[PDB]
Structure 1
Amino acid sequence: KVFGRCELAAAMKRHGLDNYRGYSLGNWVCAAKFESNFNTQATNRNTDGSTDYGILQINSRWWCNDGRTPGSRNLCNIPCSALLSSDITASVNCAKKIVSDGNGMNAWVAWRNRCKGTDVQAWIRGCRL
């Protein structure tokens, strides 16, 4: 599923991401825009052979099992394919674990490079929440 901006904002708000670990909703919407273009089915393969999955591009090196990343962890205890669902629950629950691990949203390269320090509230402007 390819979300609209406000549709995804409302879904993330319902799932508890607004102000989660101090990150306002616009941060999460901005990160999803640049990680996946709001597409739950996005995948991208990394140089180490791991793969990033879903709307928040969660990496199989640490967070999910895809059966082809040897020696990797599965810290969210989920198959990576569950992160490609039109229902964002699994992605959101795993992202809460990631953002809590000490590094905040810096775990998302696109957030660090394209959202951090910008007016992220612009990403939820106009939306009915």
Structure 2
Amino acid sequence: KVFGRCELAAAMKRHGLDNYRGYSLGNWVCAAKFESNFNTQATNRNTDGSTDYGILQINSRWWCNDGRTPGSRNLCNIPCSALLSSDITASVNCAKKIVSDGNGMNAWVAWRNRCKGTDVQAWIRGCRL
């Protein structure tokens, strides 16, 4: 599923991401835009052989099991394919674990390089929330 901007903002708000660990809703929408272009089916292969999955591009090296990343962890206790569903619950629940691990949203390279230090509130402007 390819979300609209305000549609995704409302879905993330309902799932408790607004101000989660101090990150306002616009940060999460901005991260999803640049990680996946709002597409739940996005996948991308990394150089080390791991793969990033879903709207927030969660990495199989640490967070999910895809059966093809030897020596990796599965810290969210899910198959990586669950991160590609049109229902974002699994992605959001795993993202809450990632952002709590000490490095905040810096775990998302596109957030650090394209959202951090910008007017992220623009990403929710005009939305009924």
Structure 2 stretches lacking a partner, 5+ long: none
Between the two proteins, the alignment pairs up a number of residues equal to 129
> What residue in structure 2 maps to residue 77 of structure 1?
77
Structure 1 stretches lacking a partner, 5+ long: none
Q: CA deviation at 1:35?
A: 0.1
Q: CA deviation at 1:117?
A: 0.1
Specify the SS of the correspondent of 2:94. Answer: helix
Q: CA deviation at 1:74?
A: 0.1
Q: CA deviation at 1:93?
A: 0.0
Supply the distance in 1 between the matched residues of 2:87 and 2:4 (Cα, whole angstroms): 14
Specify the SS of the correspondent of 2:102. Answer: coil
Supply the distance in 2 between the matched residues of 1:78 and 1:47 (Cα, whole angstroms): 22
1:26-105 correspondence runs (5 A): 26-105=26-105
TM-score, normalization by structure 1: 1.00
TM-score, normalization by structure 2: 1.00
Runs of 4+ off more than 3 Å: none
Q: CA deviation at 1:75?
A: 0.1
- Please list the CA deviations of residues 69-99 of structure 1 after superposition, one character each: whole Å capped at 9, or x if unmatched: 0000000000000000000000000000000
Supply the distance in 1 between the matched residues of 2:42 and 2:128 (Cα, whole angstroms): 26
Supply the distance in 2 between the matched residues of 1:94 and 1:53 (Cα, whole angstroms): 11
- Please list the CA deviations of residues 25-74 of structure 1 after superposition, one character each: whole Å capped at 9, or x if unmatched: 00000000000000000000000000000000000000000000000000
Percent identity between matched residues is 100
